Amino acid sequence: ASYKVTLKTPDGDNVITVPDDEYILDVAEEQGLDLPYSCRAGACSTCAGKLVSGPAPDQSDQSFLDDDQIQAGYILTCVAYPTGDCVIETHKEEALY
Ligand code: FES
């Protein structure tokens, strides 16, 4: 299955198609977007984004955000799979400090 993921970047909004078994960061980069990252292993906050609408992405592979933050919609985009059409704001790391 695939989903329409709207990424709202500081530069502009981009609607891309992401399959249910690929990570959002991976697919965004394939489409020419430049999103932040460092570890790419779910263990830091560099790739953080925030869910604006749509179902929550599958974060079973993330570990850095606290249960509280997954709670509130923060997403580690490097290890997040989409689970429905959704809109995510990227570059949100500063927001977690
Ligand atoms: S780049 Fe470290 S958690 Fe995604």
Side-chain angles (χ1 to χ4, degrees):
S2 64
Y3 303 113
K4 295 274 173 293
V5 176
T6 299
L7 262 2
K8 294 190 64 108
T9 75
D11 287 351
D13 305 349
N14 297 96
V15 169
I16 64 170
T17 297
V18 182
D20 64 14
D21 61 348
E22 293 184 19
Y23 294 142
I24 294 177
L25 173 64
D26 284 338
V27 176
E29 283 172 341
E30 269 165 36
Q31 321 296 144
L33 300 188
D34 158 56
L35 294 185
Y37 66 86
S38 68
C39 79
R40 306 185 74 106
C44 83
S45 53
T46 308
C47 57
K50 198 177 201 278
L51 187 64
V52 169
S53 61
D58 166 351
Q59 294 208 80
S60 49
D61 291 338
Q62 88 86 40
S63 59
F64 184 84
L65 299 168
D66 62 46
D67 297 345
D68 249 61
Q69 295 162 316
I70 297 187
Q71 205 21 244
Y74 288 102
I75 291 152
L76 295 188
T77 63
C78 70
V79 288
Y81 293 110
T83 66
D85 295 345
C86 64
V87 180
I88 296 167
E89 53 192 336
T90 66
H91 298 78
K92 300 286 313 170
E93 173 172 47
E94 297 300 332
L96 301 163
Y97 288 151

Coordinates of all heavy atoms in Angstrom, one line a residue:
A1 N 0.9 -1.2 0.0 CA 0.0 0.0 0.0 C 0.9 1.2 0.0 O 2.0 1.0 0.4 CB -0.8 0.0 1.3
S2 N 0.4 2.3 -0.5 CA 1.2 3.5 -0.4 C 0.3 4.6 0.1 O -1.0 4.5 0.1 CB 1.8 3.8 -1.7 OG 0.8 4.1 -2.7
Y3 N 0.9 5.7 0.6 CA 0.2 6.8 1.2 C 0.8 8.1 0.7 O 1.9 8.2 0.4 CB 0.4 6.7 2.7 CG -0.1 5.4 3.3 CD1 0.7 4.5 3.8 CD2 -1.5 5.1 3.2 CE1 0.2 3.3 4.3 CE2 -2.0 4.0 3.6 CZ -1.2 3.1 4.2 OH -1.7 1.9 4.6
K4 N -0.1 9.1 0.6 CA 0.3 10.4 0.3 C 0.8 11.1 1.6 O 0.0 11.3 2.5 CB -0.8 11.3 -0.3 CG -1.3 10.7 -1.6 CD -0.4 11.3 -2.8 CE -0.7 10.6 -4.1 NZ -0.2 9.1 -4.1
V5 N 2.1 11.5 1.6 CA 2.7 12.1 2.8 C 3.1 13.5 2.4 O 3.9 13.7 1.4 CB 4.0 11.3 3.2 CG1 4.6 12.1 4.4 CG2 3.6 9.9 3.7
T6 N 2.5 14.5 3.0 CA 2.8 15.9 2.7 C 3.9 16.3 3.7 O 3.7 16.3 4.9 CB 1.6 16.8 2.9 OG1 0.6 16.4 2.0 CG2 1.9 18.3 2.7
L7 N 5.1 16.6 3.2 CA 6.2 17.1 4.2 C 6.2 18.7 4.1 O 6.4 19.3 3.0 CB 7.5 16.5 3.7 CG 8.2 15.2 4.2 CD1 7.4 14.5 5.3 CD2 8.6 14.3 3.1
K8 N 6.0 19.3 5.2 CA 5.9 20.8 5.3 C 7.3 21.2 5.8 O 7.6 21.0 6.9 CB 4.9 21.3 6.3 CG 3.4 20.9 5.8 CD 2.3 21.5 6.7 CE 2.3 23.0 6.5 NZ 1.2 23.4 5.7
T9 N 8.2 21.6 4.8 CA 9.6 21.9 5.2 C 9.7 23.5 5.4 O 8.9 24.3 4.9 CB 10.6 21.4 4.1 OG1 10.5 22.2 2.9 CG2 10.2 19.9 3.8
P10 N 10.8 23.9 6.0 CA 10.9 25.4 6.2 C 10.9 26.1 4.8 O 10.4 27.2 4.7 CB 12.3 25.5 6.9 CG 12.4 24.2 7.6 CD 11.9 23.2 6.7
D11 N 11.3 25.4 3.8 CA 11.3 25.9 2.4 C 9.9 25.8 1.7 O 9.7 26.7 0.9 CB 12.4 25.2 1.6 CG 13.8 25.7 2.0 OD1 13.9 26.6 2.8 OD2 14.8 25.1 1.6
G12 N 9.1 24.8 1.9 CA 7.8 24.7 1.2 C 7.3 23.3 1.5 O 7.9 22.4 2.1
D13 N 6.0 23.1 1.0 CA 5.3 21.8 1.1 C 5.5 20.9 0.0 O 5.4 21.3 -1.2 CB 3.8 22.0 1.2 CG 3.4 22.9 2.3 OD1 4.3 23.2 3.1 OD2 2.2 23.4 2.3
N14 N 5.8 19.6 0.3 CA 5.9 18.7 -0.8 C 5.1 17.4 -0.6 O 5.3 16.7 0.4 CB 7.4 18.3 -0.9 CG 8.2 19.5 -1.3 OD1 8.8 20.1 -0.4 ND2 8.3 19.8 -2.5
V15 N 4.3 17.1 -1.5 CA 3.4 15.9 -1.5 C 4.2 14.8 -2.2 O 4.6 14.9 -3.4 CB 2.1 16.1 -2.2 CG1 1.4 14.8 -2.3 CG2 1.3 17.1 -1.4
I16 N 4.5 13.8 -1.5 CA 5.2 12.6 -2.1 C 4.4 11.3 -1.8 O 3.5 11.2 -0.9 CB 6.6 12.5 -1.7 CG1 6.8 12.2 -0.3 CG2 7.4 13.7 -2.1 CD1 8.2 11.7 0.2
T17 N 4.7 10.2 -2.5 CA 4.0 8.9 -2.3 C 5.0 8.0 -1.6 O 6.1 7.7 -2.1 CB 3.6 8.3 -3.6 OG1 2.7 9.1 -4.3 CG2 3.0 6.9 -3.4
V18 N 4.6 7.6 -0.4 CA 5.5 6.7 0.3 C 4.9 5.3 0.5 O 3.7 5.3 1.1 CB 5.8 7.3 1.7 CG1 6.8 6.5 2.5 CG2 6.3 8.8 1.5
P19 N 5.5 4.2 0.1 CA 5.0 2.9 0.4 C 4.9 2.5 1.9 O 5.7 3.1 2.7 CB 6.0 1.9 -0.3 CG 6.7 2.8 -1.3 CD 6.8 4.1 -0.6
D20 N 4.0 1.6 2.3 CA 4.0 1.3 3.7 C 5.2 0.6 4.3 O 5.3 0.4 5.6 CB 2.7 0.5 4.1 CG 2.7 -0.9 3.4 OD1 3.7 -1.3 2.9 OD2 1.6 -1.5 3.4
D21 N 6.1 0.1 3.5 CA 7.3 -0.6 4.0 C 8.6 0.1 3.7 O 9.7 -0.6 3.7 CB 7.4 -2.0 3.4 CG 7.5 -2.0 1.9 OD1 7.3 -0.9 1.2 OD2 7.8 -3.1 1.4
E22 N 8.6 1.4 3.5 CA 9.8 2.2 3.4 C 9.7 3.4 4.4 O 8.7 3.9 4.6 CB 9.9 2.8 1.9 CG 10.1 1.7 0.9 CD 10.2 2.1 -0.6 OE1 10.5 3.3 -0.9 OE2 10.0 1.2 -1.5
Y23 N 10.9 3.8 4.8 CA 10.9 4.9 5.8 C 10.7 6.2 5.1 O 11.1 6.5 4.0 CB 12.3 4.9 6.5 CG 12.7 3.7 7.4 CD1 14.0 3.2 7.4 CD2 11.7 3.2 8.3 CE1 14.3 2.2 8.3 CE2 12.1 2.3 9.3 CZ 13.4 1.8 9.3 OH 13.9 0.9 10.1
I24 N 10.1 7.2 5.9 CA 9.8 8.4 5.3 C 11.0 9.2 4.9 O 11.0 9.8 3.8 CB 8.9 9.3 6.3 CG1 7.6 8.5 6.4 CG2 8.7 10.7 5.8 CD1 6.6 9.2 7.4
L25 N 12.1 9.2 5.7 CA 13.3 10.0 5.3 C 13.8 9.4 3.9 O 14.2 10.2 3.0 CB 14.3 9.9 6.4 CG 15.7 10.6 6.1 CD1 15.5 12.1 5.8 CD2 16.6 10.3 7.2
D26 N 13.9 8.0 3.9 CA 14.5 7.4 2.7 C 13.8 7.8 1.5 O 14.4 8.2 0.5 CB 14.5 5.8 2.9 CG 15.5 5.3 3.8 OD1 16.5 6.0 4.0 OD2 15.3 4.1 4.3
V27 N 12.5 7.7 1.5 CA 11.7 8.0 0.3 C 11.7 9.5 0.0 O 11.8 9.9 -1.2 CB 10.2 7.5 0.4 CG1 9.5 8.0 -0.8 CG2 10.3 6.0 0.6
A28 N 11.8 10.4 1.0 CA 11.9 11.8 0.7 C 13.2 12.2 0.0 O 13.2 13.0 -0.9 CB 11.8 12.6 2.0
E29 N 14.3 11.6 0.4 CA 15.6 11.8 -0.2 C 15.6 11.3 -1.7 O 16.2 12.0 -2.5 CB 16.6 11.1 0.6 CG 17.0 11.7 2.0 CD 17.9 10.8 2.8 OE1 18.0 9.6 2.6 OE2 18.5 11.4 3.8
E30 N 14.9 10.2 -1.9 CA 14.8 9.6 -3.3 C 14.1 10.6 -4.2 O 14.3 10.7 -5.3 CB 13.9 8.3 -3.3 CG 14.5 6.9 -3.1 CD 13.4 5.9 -2.8 OE1 12.2 6.0 -3.3 OE2 13.7 5.0 -1.9
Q31 N 13.2 11.5 -3.6 CA 12.5 12.5 -4.3 C 13.1 13.8 -4.4 O 12.5 14.8 -4.8 CB 11.0 12.5 -3.8 CG 10.5 11.1 -3.4 CD 10.3 10.1 -4.6 OE1 10.6 8.9 -4.5 NE2 9.9 10.7 -5.8
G32 N 14.4 13.9 -3.9 CA 15.1 15.1 -4.0 C 15.0 16.1 -2.9 O 15.3 17.2 -3.0
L33 N 14.4 15.6 -1.7 CA 14.2 16.5 -0.6 C 15.5 16.4 0.3 O 16.0 15.3 0.4 CB 13.0 16.2 0.2 CG 11.7 16.2 -0.6 CD1 10.4 16.1 0.4 CD2 11.6 17.6 -1.3
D34 N 15.8 17.5 1.1 CA 17.0 17.4 1.9 C 16.4 17.6 3.3 O 16.0 18.7 3.7 CB 18.0 18.6 1.6 CG 19.0 19.0 2.7 OD1 19.7 18.1 3.3 OD2 19.0 20.2 3.1
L35 N 16.4 16.5 4.1 CA 15.9 16.6 5.4 C 17.0 16.3 6.4 O 18.0 15.5 6.0 CB 14.8 15.5 5.6 CG 13.5 15.8 4.7 CD1 12.5 14.7 5.1 CD2 13.0 17.2 4.9
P36 N 17.0 16.8 7.6 CA 18.0 16.5 8.6 C 18.1 15.1 9.1 O 17.1 14.4 9.2 CB 17.7 17.5 9.7 CG 16.1 17.6 9.7 CD 15.9 17.6 8.2
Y37 N 19.4 14.7 9.4 CA 19.6 13.4 10.0 C 21.1 13.3 10.5 O 21.9 14.1 10.0 CB 19.4 12.3 9.0 CG 20.4 12.2 7.8 CD1 21.6 11.6 8.0 CD2 20.2 12.9 6.6 CE1 22.6 11.6 7.0 CE2 21.1 12.9 5.6 CZ 22.3 12.2 5.8 OH 23.2 12.3 4.7
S38 N 21.3 12.4 11.4 CA 22.6 12.0 11.7 C 22.7 10.5 12.0 O 23.1 9.8 11.1 CB 23.1 12.9 13.0 OG 22.4 12.5 14.1
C39 N 22.2 9.9 13.1 CA 22.4 8.5 13.3 C 21.6 7.6 12.4 O 22.1 6.4 12.2 CB 22.1 8.2 14.8 SG 20.3 8.1 15.2
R40 N 20.5 8.0 11.9 CA 19.6 7.2 11.1 C 19.2 5.9 11.7 O 18.9 4.9 11.1 CB 20.2 6.9 9.7 CG 20.6 8.2 9.0 CD 21.1 7.9 7.5 NE 19.9 7.6 6.7 CZ 19.5 8.5 5.7 NH1 20.0 9.7 5.6 NH2 18.4 8.1 5.0
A41 N 19.1 5.9 13.1 CA 18.9 4.6 13.8 C 17.8 4.8 15.0 O 17.7 4.0 15.9 CB 20.2 4.1 14.4
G42 N 17.1 6.0 14.9 CA 16.1 6.2 15.9 C 16.6 6.5 17.2 O 15.9 6.4 18.2
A43 N 17.9 6.9 17.3 CA 18.4 7.2 18.7 C 18.9 8.6 19.0 O 19.8 8.8 19.9 CB 19.6 6.2 18.9
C44 N 18.3 9.5 18.3 CA 18.7 10.9 18.5 C 17.5 11.7 18.1 O 16.4 11.2 17.9 CB 20.0 11.3 17.7 SG 19.9 11.7 16.0
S45 N 17.7 13.0 18.0 CA 16.5 13.8 17.6 C 16.7 14.6 16.4 O 15.9 15.4 16.0 CB 16.2 14.8 18.8 OG 17.4 15.5 19.1
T46 N 17.8 14.3 15.7 CA 18.1 15.2 14.5 C 17.1 15.2 13.4 O 16.9 16.2 12.7 CB 19.5 14.7 13.9 OG1 20.5 14.6 15.0 CG2 20.0 15.7 12.8
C47 N 16.5 14.1 13.1 CA 15.5 13.9 12.0 C 14.1 14.2 12.5 O 13.1 13.9 11.8 CB 15.4 12.4 11.6 SG 15.0 11.3 12.7
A48 N 13.9 14.8 13.7 CA 12.5 14.9 14.2 C 11.7 15.7 13.4 O 12.0 16.7 12.8 CB 12.6 15.7 15.6
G49 N 10.4 15.2 13.3 CA 9.4 16.0 12.6 C 8.1 16.0 13.6 O 8.2 15.4 14.7
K50 N 7.0 16.6 13.2 CA 5.8 16.6 14.0 C 4.6 16.4 13.1 O 4.4 17.0 12.1 CB 5.7 17.9 14.8 CG 4.8 17.8 16.0 CD 4.8 19.2 16.8 CE 4.2 18.9 18.2 NZ 2.7 18.9 18.1
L51 N 3.8 15.5 13.6 CA 2.5 15.1 12.9 C 1.5 16.2 12.9 O 1.3 16.8 14.1 CB 1.9 13.9 13.6 CG 0.7 13.2 12.8 CD1 1.2 12.7 11.4 CD2 0.1 12.2 13.6
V52 N 1.0 16.6 11.8 CA 0.0 17.7 11.7 C -1.4 17.1 11.5 O -2.4 17.5 12.1 CB 0.3 18.6 10.4 CG1 -0.9 19.6 10.2 CG2 1.6 19.3 10.6
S53 N -1.5 16.0 10.7 CA -2.7 15.3 10.5 C -2.6 14.0 9.9 O -1.5 13.7 9.4 CB -3.7 16.1 9.6 OG -3.2 16.3 8.3
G54 N -3.5 13.1 10.0 CA -3.4 11.7 9.6 C -3.0 10.8 10.6 O -2.7 11.3 11.7
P55 N -3.1 9.5 10.4 CA -2.7 8.6 11.4 C -1.2 8.6 11.8 O -0.4 9.0 11.0 CB -3.0 7.2 10.8 CG -2.9 7.4 9.5 CD -3.5 8.8 9.1
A56 N -0.9 8.2 13.0 CA 0.4 8.2 13.4 C 1.3 7.2 12.6 O 0.9 6.1 12.4 CB 0.5 7.9 14.9
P57 N 2.5 7.6 12.2 CA 3.4 6.7 11.5 C 3.8 5.6 12.5 O 3.8 5.8 13.7 CB 4.6 7.6 11.2 CG 4.0 9.0 11.1 CD 2.9 9.0 12.1
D58 N 4.2 4.5 12.0 CA 4.7 3.3 12.8 C 6.1 3.7 13.2 O 7.0 3.7 12.3 CB 4.7 2.0 11.9 CG 5.6 0.9 12.5 OD1 6.3 1.0 13.5 OD2 5.4 -0.2 11.8
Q59 N 6.3 3.8 14.5 CA 7.6 4.1 15.2 C 8.1 3.0 16.0 O 8.8 3.2 17.0 CB 7.5 5.4 16.0 CG 7.2 6.6 15.1 CD 7.6 8.0 15.7 OE1 8.8 8.4 15.7 NE2 6.7 8.7 16.3
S60 N 7.7 1.8 15.7 CA 8.1 0.6 16.5 C 9.7 0.6 16.5 O 10.2 0.0 17.4 CB 7.6 -0.6 15.9 OG 7.7 -0.8 14.6
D61 N 10.3 1.2 15.5 CA 11.8 1.1 15.5 C 12.5 2.3 16.2 O 13.7 2.3 16.2 CB 12.3 1.1 14.0 CG 12.0 -0.3 13.3 OD1 11.8 -1.3 14.0 OD2 12.0 -0.3 12.0
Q62 N 11.8 3.3 16.7 CA 12.4 4.4 17.4 C 12.7 4.2 18.9 O 12.0 3.3 19.5 CB 11.5 5.7 17.2 CG 10.5 5.9 18.3 CD 11.1 6.7 19.5 OE1 11.9 7.6 19.4 NE2 10.6 6.3 20.7
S63 N 13.6 4.9 19.4 CA 13.9 4.7 20.9 C 14.2 6.0 21.6 O 13.8 6.2 22.8 CB 15.1 3.7 21.1 OG 16.3 4.2 20.5
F64 N 14.7 7.0 20.9 CA 15.0 8.3 21.6 C 13.9 9.1 22.1 O 14.0 9.6 23.3 CB 15.8 9.2 20.6 CG 16.2 10.5 21.3 CD1 17.4 10.5 22.1 CD2 15.5 11.7 21.0 CE1 17.9 11.7 22.6 CE2 16.0 12.9 21.6 CZ 17.2 12.9 22.3
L65 N 12.7 9.3 21.4 CA 11.7 10.1 22.0 C 11.1 9.3 23.2 O 11.0 8.1 23.2 CB 10.6 10.4 20.9 CG 11.2 11.2 19.7 CD1 10.1 11.1 18.6 CD2 11.5 12.6 20.0
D66 N 10.7 10.1 24.2 CA 10.1 9.5 25.3 C 8.6 9.3 25.0 O 8.0 10.0 24.1 CB 10.3 10.2 26.6 CG 9.6 11.7 26.6 OD1 8.5 11.8 26.2 OD2 10.3 12.6 27.1
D67 N 8.1 8.2 25.6 CA 6.7 7.8 25.4 C 5.8 9.0 25.3 O 4.8 9.0 24.6 CB 6.3 6.9 26.5 CG 7.1 5.6 26.5 OD1 7.8 5.3 25.5 OD2 7.1 4.9 27.6
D68 N 6.2 10.0 26.1 CA 5.4 11.3 26.2 C 5.5 12.0 24.9 O 4.5 12.6 24.5 CB 6.1 12.2 27.3 CG 5.2 12.4 28.5 OD1 5.0 11.4 29.2 OD2 4.9 13.6 28.8
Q69 N 6.7 12.0 24.3 CA 6.8 12.7 23.0 C 6.1 12.0 21.8 O 5.6 12.7 20.9 CB 8.3 13.0 22.8 CG 9.0 14.0 23.8 CD 10.5 13.9 23.8 OE1 11.1 12.8 23.8 NE2 11.2 15.1 23.9
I70 N 6.1 10.7 21.9 CA 5.5 10.0 20.8 C 4.0 10.3 20.9 O 3.3 10.6 19.9 CB 5.7 8.5 20.9 CG1 7.2 8.2 20.8 CG2 5.0 7.7 19.8 CD1 7.5 6.7 20.8
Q71 N 3.7 10.5 22.1 CA 2.4 10.9 22.6 C 1.8 12.1 21.8 O 0.7 12.1 21.2 CB 2.6 11.3 24.1 CG 1.4 11.2 24.7 CD 0.6 10.3 23.9 OE1 -0.4 10.7 23.3 NE2 1.1 9.0 23.7
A72 N 2.6 13.1 22.0 CA 2.4 14.5 21.4 C 2.6 14.7 19.9 O 2.5 15.9 19.4 CB 3.3 15.3 22.1
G73 N 2.9 13.6 19.2 CA 3.1 13.7 17.7 C 4.5 13.9 17.1 O 4.6 14.1 15.9
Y74 N 5.6 13.9 18.0 CA 6.9 14.0 17.4 C 7.2 12.6 16.8 O 6.8 11.6 17.3 CB 8.0 14.4 18.5 CG 7.8 15.9 18.8 CD1 7.2 16.2 20.0 CD2 8.3 16.8 18.0 CE1 7.0 17.6 20.2 CE2 8.1 18.2 18.2 CZ 7.4 18.5 19.4 OH 7.1 19.9 19.6
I75 N 8.0 12.7 15.7 CA 8.4 11.6 14.9 C 9.8 11.6 14.5 O 10.3 12.6 14.1 CB 7.5 11.7 13.5 CG1 6.0 11.4 13.8 CG2 8.0 10.5 12.5 CD1 5.3 12.2 12.6
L76 N 10.4 10.5 14.6 CA 11.8 10.3 14.1 C 11.7 9.7 12.7 O 11.4 8.5 12.5 CB 12.6 9.4 15.0 CG 12.8 9.9 16.5 CD1 13.8 8.9 17.2 CD2 13.3 11.4 16.5
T77 N 11.8 10.7 11.8 CA 11.6 10.4 10.4 C 12.5 9.3 9.8 O 12.1 8.7 8.8 CB 11.5 11.7 9.5 OG1 12.8 12.3 9.5 CG2 10.4 12.6 10.0
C78 N 13.7 9.2 10.3 CA 14.6 8.2 9.7 C 14.1 6.7 9.9 O 14.6 5.8 9.2 CB 16.0 8.4 10.3 SG 16.1 7.9 12.1
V79 N 13.2 6.4 10.8 CA 12.9 5.1 11.0 C 11.3 5.0 11.1 O 10.8 4.1 11.7 CB 13.5 4.5 12.4 CG1 15.0 4.3 12.2 CG2 13.2 5.4 13.6
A80 N 10.6 6.0 10.6 CA 9.1 6.0 10.6 C 8.5 5.5 9.2 O 8.8 6.0 8.2 CB 8.7 7.4 10.8
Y81 N 7.6 4.6 9.4 CA 6.8 4.1 8.2 C 5.5 4.8 8.2 O 4.9 4.9 9.2 CB 6.5 2.6 8.3 CG 7.7 1.8 8.3 CD1 8.1 1.1 9.4 CD2 8.4 1.6 7.0 CE1 9.3 0.2 9.3 CE2 9.4 0.7 7.0 CZ 9.9 0.0 8.0 OH 10.9 -0.8 7.9
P82 N 4.9 5.3 7.1 CA 3.6 5.9 7.1 C 2.6 4.8 7.3 O 2.8 3.6 6.8 CB 3.4 6.4 5.7 CG 4.3 5.5 4.8 CD 5.5 5.2 5.7
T83 N 1.5 5.1 7.9 CA 0.4 4.1 8.1 C -0.9 4.7 7.5 O -2.0 4.0 7.5 CB 0.1 3.7 9.5 OG1 -0.4 4.8 10.2 CG2 1.4 3.3 10.2
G84 N -0.9 5.9 6.9 CA -2.1 6.4 6.2 C -1.7 7.7 5.6 O -0.5 8.2 5.8
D85 N -2.5 8.4 4.8 CA -2.2 9.7 4.2 C -2.0 10.6 5.4 O -2.7 10.6 6.4 CB -3.3 10.2 3.3 CG -3.5 9.4 2.0 OD1 -2.6 8.6 1.6 OD2 -4.6 9.6 1.4
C86 N -0.9 11.4 5.4 CA -0.7 12.2 6.5 C 0.2 13.4 6.2 O 0.7 13.6 5.1 CB 0.0 11.4 7.6 SG 1.6 10.7 7.1
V87 N 0.2 14.4 7.1 CA 0.9 15.6 6.9 C 1.9 15.8 8.0 O 1.5 15.6 9.2 CB -0.1 16.8 6.9 CG1 0.7 18.2 6.7 CG2 -1.0 16.7 5.8
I88 N 3.2 16.0 7.7 CA 4.2 16.1 8.8 C 5.1 17.3 8.6 O 5.5 17.6 7.5 CB 5.1 14.8 8.7 CG1 4.3 13.5 9.0 CG2 6.4 14.9 9.6 CD1 5.1 12.3 8.6
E89 N 5.3 18.0 9.7 CA 6.2 19.2 9.6 C 7.7 18.7 9.9 O 7.9 17.9 10.9 CB 5.8 20.3 10.6 CG 5.6 20.0 12.1 CD 4.9 21.3 12.7 OE1 5.1 22.4 12.2 OE2 4.3 21.1 13.8
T90 N 8.6 19.0 9.0 CA 10.0 18.6 9.2 C 10.8 19.6 10.0 O 10.3 20.7 10.3 CB 10.6 18.2 7.9 OG1 10.8 19.4 7.2 CG2 9.7 17.3 7.0
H91 N 12.0 19.2 10.3 CA 13.0 20.1 11.0 C 12.5 20.6 12.3 O 12.6 21.8 12.6 CB 13.3 21.3 10.0 CG 14.0 21.0 8.7 ND1 13.3 20.5 7.6 CD2 15.2 21.2 8.3 CE1 14.1 20.4 6.6 NE2 15.3 20.8 7.0
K92 N 12.0 19.8 13.1 CA 11.4 20.1 14.4 C 12.3 19.8 15.6 O 11.8 19.8 16.7 CB 10.1 19.5 14.5 CG 9.1 19.9 13.4 CD 8.6 21.4 13.6 CE 8.1 21.6 15.0 NZ 7.9 23.0 15.2
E93 N 13.6 19.5 15.4 CA 14.4 19.1 16.5 C 14.5 20.2 17.7 O 14.4 19.9 18.9 CB 15.8 18.8 16.0 CG 16.8 18.6 17.2 CD 18.2 18.1 16.7 OE1 18.7 18.7 15.8 OE2 18.6 17.2 17.4
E94 N 14.6 21.5 17.3 CA 14.7 22.6 18.3 C 13.6 22.6 19.2 O 13.7 22.9 20.4 CB 14.7 24.0 17.5 CG 15.8 24.3 16.5 CD 17.3 24.4 17.0 OE1 17.6 24.7 18.2 OE2 18.2 24.2 16.1
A95 N 12.4 22.1 18.7 CA 11.2 22.1 19.5 C 11.3 21.1 20.6 O 10.4 21.1 21.5 CB 10.0 21.7 18.5
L96 N 12.3 20.2 20.7 CA 12.3 19.2 21.8 C 13.3 19.5 22.9 O 13.4 18.7 23.9 CB 12.8 17.9 21.2 CG 12.0 17.3 20.1 CD1 12.9 16.2 19.5 CD2 10.7 16.7 20.7
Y97 N 14.0 20.6 22.8 CA 15.1 20.9 23.8 C 14.7 21.3 25.2 O 14.4 20.5 26.0 CB 16.1 21.9 23.2 CG 16.9 21.3 22.1 CD1 17.4 22.1 21.0 CD2 17.3 20.0 22.1 CE1 18.2 21.6 20.0 CE2 18.1 19.4 21.1 CZ 18.5 20.3 20.1 OH 19.3 19.9 19.0
Ligands
FES1 S1 18.7 10.7 12.6 FE1 19.0 10.0 14.7 S2 16.9 9.4 15.3 FE2 16.8 9.8 13.1

